[PDB]
DNA sequence: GCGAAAAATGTGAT
DNA sequence: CTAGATCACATTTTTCG
DNA sequence: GCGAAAAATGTGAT
DNA sequence: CTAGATCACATTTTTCG
């Protein structure tokens, strides 16, 4: 579409697993674009604990936040969850594709619109729903987005308790017991893969 | 220029000191613009308590997140914080607007970006910081927004314990003593009008 | 600028 | 009053060559 | 079908 | 091991007409 026009002005790079693509801080001047692969977008505290503040996937743009204002620091980290093919353009160039065909600035904005929405829920269920709650709708969203083996009938994602814990913002230790005694209610399953939607005990 | 152009095309309405300007649950119709005043995006707890996610003042944008797909159920209530003068246009009558001019595709999108930046922060401060902490940062932010009135020392900011508890996410009892602690440590005063000696 | 009616809020032990 | 954190060390899963 | 390093777990009383 | 929360009606500070 239009997106193959913008995509052609873009050096196509592969990254390894666990590479960093962006650090919080770094000069913001390149607007990326995931061609293949998935990506976790974090933030971290000077003391150390981090948070997962979204996943992103094919056709998701990255580094979008700089572009509207000049010279600002990258707002979060992003580390390839797995091997990605990411493209890239300078902002100085991007804004040109824009004033040469304005549909891509549509493509882009709708991205951060769903994003402003999903994020405002995330604030909402940190001030409201306790761990068990926060944990619950999480495994839920973790099947409306790819890796959910319909164990035959019913999801089976893999994500480690430590990870869930890093989505929710609760100790790895709490994410153990709650997830555990969550199968007590016959609602869940275990090992590393969580087979959601049914469960057992 | 656009902010006076599109401003021509729109339709100015006054809303009093408290009208519930937009409502969650609902349907993405008009795209609004604060011609005068400020606003209080607040979402709602399971049943009951609000949490302010933002304020948006003179010249910010409301209900844009409707714009780029369709049938989108409105995202959070937006209640005026005072007599703010909303100048409404139209989604349908925005797209047309948007191709005789990309400049305001831009500005709306710039606001969109600024907001996901500070929203990302909230998600960070709620999980990376203790309550007194969120209370300290907040008074810092509010003293750094327009209604704040410069004072001989610091910035004062007419607000109330119930509302910091809100914005923060903690019992108004707990906003109660923290404010009296930092009171004693000279970092802040109160009387409804808390002066942030900072 | 006014005061009645309305909204803010603080005690602590668990 | 009550949920969630924190602690060490061995225990398990899980990795991949 | 491999098999020990590695990364992930669970105690449990406070 | 501890961080906030909490539930009443007296006094205070704030509203709007
Ligand atoms: N709230 C968010 N949700 C998801 N992704 C985000 C969020 N905030 C930032 N990002 C992404 O992570 C990137 C980190 O640096 P940037 O500010 O360029 O761009 C950011 C976005 O692309
Ligand atoms: N996180 C946020 N920060 C600021 N404003 C927001 C946020 N979430 C929603 N809004 C505003 O509140 C409105 C809710 O419904 P809309 O989707 O019409 O458009 C929304 C935004 O303009």
Query: Strand F and chain B: which residues 126-185 have CB closer than 7 Å?
Result: 130-132, 169-171, 173-174
Using the Cβ of A169 and the Cβ atoms of chain B, whether some distance falls under 8 Å is answered with yes
Within 8 A by CB and 6+ apart from B43, the residues are A120, A123, A124, B24, B50, B51, B53, B76, B77
Distance, CA of A167 to CA of A176 (rounded, Å): 14
Please give the helix or strand (H or E) that residue B136 lies within, else none: helix B131-142
Does the CB atom of residue B34 touch ligand 2 within 6 A? no
Domain with CATH 2.60.120.10 in chain B: 1-129
Count the Cβ atoms, other than its own, within 10 Å of residue A193. Answer: 16
Is residue A56 a contact partner of residue A62, using CB atoms and an 8 Å limit? yes
Provide the greatest CA pair distance for chain A.
59
Distance, CA of A62 to CA of A34 (rounded, Å): 7
Alpha helices in B25-102 (DSSP H): 92-99
Instruction: Write b or e for each residue in B89-103: b if 16 or more Cβ atoms lie within 10 A of its Cβ, otherwise e.
Output: bebeebeebbeeebe
Q: Which of chain E's bases lie under 7 Å from a protein CB?
A: 7-12
How distant is C1' of D2 from CA of A174, in Å? 15
Q: Which of B75, B116, B141 has most ligand 2 atoms within 8 Å of its beta carbon, as the pocket-test mutant? A: B75
How distant is C1' of D7 from CA of A194, in Å? 28
Q: Identify which of B45, B106, B113 has the shortest CB distance to residue A128.
A: B45
- Distance from the Cα of residue A88 to its chain's centroid: 19
Q: Identify which of A98, A119, A124 has the shortest CB distance to residue B51.
A: A124
Distance, CA of B32 to CA of B61 (rounded, Å): 6
Interchain pair A109, B110: CB under 8 A: no
Count the Cβ atoms, other than its own, within 10 Å of residue B129. Answer: 15
Q: What three-state secondary structure class fits B70?
A: coil
How far apart, in Å, are the Cα atoms of A41 and each of A54, A59, A167, A187, B107?
Answer: 5, 15, 11, 29, 25
Is strand F in 7 Å reach of the CB of B46? Answer: no
Distance, CA of A16 to CA of A81 (rounded, Å): 9
Q: Give ∠ CA A128-A129-A132 in degrees, rounded to 5.
A: 160
Name which CATH class applies to B130-197.
mainly alpha
DSSP character for B31?
-
Nearest CA to A81 out of A168, A140, A25, A160 is that of: A160
Distance, CA of A47 to CA of A28 (rounded, Å): 24
Alpha helices in A36-171 (DSSP H): 91-100, 104-127, 131-141, 161-168
Closest amino acid to nucleotide E12 (CA–C1'): A173
Question: What is the crossing angle of helices B161-168 and B172-184, to 10°?
Answer: 110
Query: Strand D and chain A: which residues 132-151 have CB closer than 7 Å?
Result: 132
Does the CB atom of residue B75 touch ligand 2 within 6 A? yes
**Sign of the alpha-carbon dihedral angle for A141, A147, A151, A152:** positive
DSSP character for B109?
H
- Give me the numbers of helices (H) and strands (E) for chain A, helices first please: 6, 9
DSSP character for A50?
E
How far apart, in Å, are the Cα atoms of A45 and each of A30, B124, B128, B145?
Answer: 24, 9, 7, 25
Q: Which atom of ligand 2 is the closest one to the Cα of A120?
A: 1
How far apart, in Å, are the Cα atoms of B152 and each of B31, B139, B189?
Answer: 40, 17, 13
Using the Cβ of A46 and the Cβ atoms of chain B, whether some distance falls under 8 Å is answered with no
Distance, CA of A137 to CA of A180 (rounded, Å): 16
Q: Give ∠ CA A181-A122-A196 in degrees, rounded to 5.
A: 35
Distance, CA of B196 to CA of B178 (rounded, Å): 13
Does the CB atom of residue B30 touch ligand 2 within 6 A? no
Residues of A in contact with B64 (CB under 8 A): 113
Resolved by: X-ray
Domain with CATH 1.10.10.10 in chain B: 130-197
Q: Which two structure tokens, joined as six digits, stand for A9?
A: 């002005």
Q: Give ∠ CA B23-B72-A51 in degrees, rounded to 5.
A: 85
Tracing tokens 């969650």 back to the chain, one arrives at B24
Residues with CB under 7 A from strand C: B 160-162, 172-173, 175-177, 179-180, 192
Distance, CA of A175 to CA of A162 (rounded, Å): 7
Fold observed for domain B1-129? Jelly Rolls (2.60.120)
């Amino acid at each position: 579409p239009t997106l193959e026009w913008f995509l052609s002005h873009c050096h196509i790079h592969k990254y390894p697993s666990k590479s960093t693509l962006i650090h919080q801080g770094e000069k913001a001047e390149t607007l990326y674009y995931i061609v293949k692969g998935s990506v976790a977008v974090l933030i971290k505290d000077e003391e150390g604990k981090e948070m997962i503040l979204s996943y992103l996937n094919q056709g998701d743009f990255i580094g979008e936040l700089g572009l509207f204002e000049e010279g600002q620091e990258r707002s979060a980290w992003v580390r390839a969850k797995t091997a990605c093919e990411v493209a890239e353009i300078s902002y100085k160039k991007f804004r040109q594709l824009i004033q040469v065909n304005p549909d891509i600035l549509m493509r882009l904005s709708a991205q951060m619109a769903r994003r402003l929405q999903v994020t405002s829920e995330k604030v909402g269920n940190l001030a409201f729903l306790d761990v068990t709650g926060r944990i619950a709708q999480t495994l839920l969203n973790l099947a409306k987005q790819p890796d959910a083996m319909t164990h035959p009938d019913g999801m089976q994602i893999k994500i480690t308790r430590q990870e869930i814990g890093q989505i929710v913002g609760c100790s790895r230790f709490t994410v153990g017991r709650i997830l555990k005694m969550l199968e007590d209610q016959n609602l869940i399953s275990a090992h590393g893969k969580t087979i959601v939607v049914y469960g057992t005990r």
